[PDB]
Structure 1
């Protein structure tokens, strides 16, 4: 990055609190020494021999996003084998931080979250970007009750891993076109984010994703099996027919039939009035008292 700060970020910010980790790195709450503005600073250990392609990709993804529902990027620092990515601070943390205190979200609360995430996903997919890690831990909430997607760590890692395999596949002259296609395009597309959103709506409603108690390797085998049945909401009567249908369509098994983010934004669950940040401000009041 030519815009990188070759300086210690503690010249500009006071580190206030450890916020936890992401796919990689550790996130800090920090305060601008001159303005008093709060930021989130993600510190990643970056040794001299290490491949910097994943972090280069993550900063490129963030830097070229200009949408309210994607965490804002302020800049990055490189100093003493540490790279610091400076981003928008979201005072209430993740939806997982929240629901671990408050309990299950109401259907209206889930609907507002799903609409805001779909707006961010529509934007990302309009740039040929894929989040690939949509879940409650990656959906952040600020003090105003606004929603922001975060942690492009998985997306950047896939992007760097695919580019590293490309320069090392060797002679392709005897390769089958499907092997070359998966080596260049990963074998799936942006609709994987729509499925993840459906699982996330279940997560916000039930405090855990479906099959959370099943071994992760076994969950992968069950999903790859012909005849895999998409998950559903456990309680029938507690949720509206519109919410049950939202889960049904986002959790379409075939990616060829799964609706896009833009198509999902016209679903009645997320296009209803009364969907605004005040619903999350009520959730934040429940967290406090």
Structure 2
């Protein structure tokens, strides 16, 4: 907001495509030739904290920020371009990922969460659609629009219901919650990647919240049992823990068998980006 450039962004950037719907364009720094992504939102001068959260980030797993432009009542946010788009854009064509593929993504997201949490920040919208893959098979985090800055417990009722932790769903009754909700959202996201839908996705979202506040609510499991390994079923069991008091941190999960086992690298995602042909 204070480091905004009052400049037409088209001055130094060729816009190349429409990808969004706020709207999001593929662009190119004219002099540099470097690709970027410009998120444009129409702004009547009469929730822009996403800027505050990104400008202060400095991590490979978090989408990179380059500056914000404001022109003619239009707000443009310049960020790091990711060739293959979201994992949702991908898996919809590809089909469900392998366990190694899923394993890699979780390690990378947990890397981005660990950093983000130590910065005293929660994403609160971890889902396949907010995880971006660059042409080099790398993983980045995006859509910090509903993400929160702490400085100790959040009170807001927000998220995408299917991916929302139960302590968030019940926030109006159970009081504040904290950063362990991104770990729940990650577990759901693992299943999203495994089954192409999050659990209960055909249920009305508001109902899925109510259901998940019920006493005796059972956290989701993977459907095909034998299809996945012992290490994966456990990763789900523990990430999807109801009591946030008992649910592991990002740091503790990075040392889990599923994400600590060898073989995991940006290669498996390139192997996934091949199936897009």
Report if TM-score (shorter chain) is over 0.5: yes
Measure, in 2, the Cα distance between the counterparts of 1:257 and 1:232.
Answer: 18
- Pick from 199, 208, 219: which aligns with 2:188? 199
Shift of residue 177, structure 1, vs aligned partner = 22
Shift of the 151–165 alpha-carbon distance from structure 1 to 2, 3 Å rule, reads closer
Shift of residue 170, structure 1, vs aligned partner = 27
Shift of residue 148, structure 1, vs aligned partner = 0.2
Measure, in 2, the Cα distance between the counterparts of 1:175 and 1:148.
Answer: 20
Measure, in 2, the Cα distance between the counterparts of 1:176 and 1:229.
Answer: 13
Measure, in 2, the Cα distance between the counterparts of 1:174 and 1:208.
Answer: 11
Shift of residue 133, structure 1, vs aligned partner = 0.1
**Could you list the runs of 5+ residues in structure 1 that have no partner in the other structure?**
49-54
Give 1:122's aligned residue.
114
Tell me how many residue pairs correspond in the alignment.
276
Shift of the 46–164 alpha-carbon distance from structure 1 to 2, 3 Å rule, reads farther
Shift of residue 167, structure 1, vs aligned partner = 15
TM (normalized to structure 2)? 0.90
Measure, in 2, the Cα distance between the counterparts of 1:110 and 1:174.
Answer: 16
Shift of the 19–185 alpha-carbon distance from structure 1 to 2, 3 Å rule, reads farther
Shift of residue 21, structure 1, vs aligned partner = 2.9
**CA offsets, 1:91-110, max 9 Å, x none?**
00000000000000000000
SS for the counterpart of 1:40 is strand
Comparing 139-148 with 180-189, greater Cα deviation is found at 180-189
Shift of the 109–170 alpha-carbon distance from structure 1 to 2, 3 Å rule, reads closer
Shift of residue 179, structure 1, vs aligned partner = 15
Shift of the 212–183 alpha-carbon distance from structure 1 to 2, 3 Å rule, reads closer
Shift of the 28–277 alpha-carbon distance from structure 1 to 2, 3 Å rule, reads same
SS for the counterpart of 1:140 is strand
Measure, in 2, the Cα distance between the counterparts of 1:137 and 1:100.
Answer: 11
**CA offsets, 1:45-74, max 9 Å, x none?**
1102xxxxxx44111100000000000000
Instruction: Answer 1 or 2: which has greater helix percent.
Output: 1
Give 1:52's aligned residue.
none
CA contact (8 A) 2:155 2:177 kept: no
CA contact (8 A) 2:16 2:27 kept: yes
Q: Rg bigger for which structure?
A: 1
CA contact (8 A) 1:43 1:84 kept: yes
1:33 counterpart = 2:33:
no
**Could you list the runs of 5+ residues in structure 2 that have no partner in the other structure?**
none
SS for the counterpart of 1:20 is coil
Shift of residue 175, structure 1, vs aligned partner = 28
Give 1:263's aligned residue.
252
CA contact (8 A) 1:166 1:184 kept: no
Structure 1 runs of 4+ with >6 Å offset: 163-186
Measure, in 2, the Cα distance between the counterparts of 1:176 and 1:206.
Answer: 19
Shift of the 237–29 alpha-carbon distance from structure 1 to 2, 3 Å rule, reads same
Shift of the 269–13 alpha-carbon distance from structure 1 to 2, 3 Å rule, reads same
**CA offsets, 1:157-202, max 9 Å, x none?**
999xxx9999999999999999999899971100000000000000
Measure, in 2, the Cα distance between the counterparts of 1:241 and 1:164.
Answer: 34
Shift of residue 20, structure 1, vs aligned partner = 1.4
Shift of the 108–128 alpha-carbon distance from structure 1 to 2, 3 Å rule, reads same
How much is the aligned-residue C-alpha RMSD, in angstroms? Answer: 6.1
Shift of the 263–221 alpha-carbon distance from structure 1 to 2, 3 Å rule, reads same
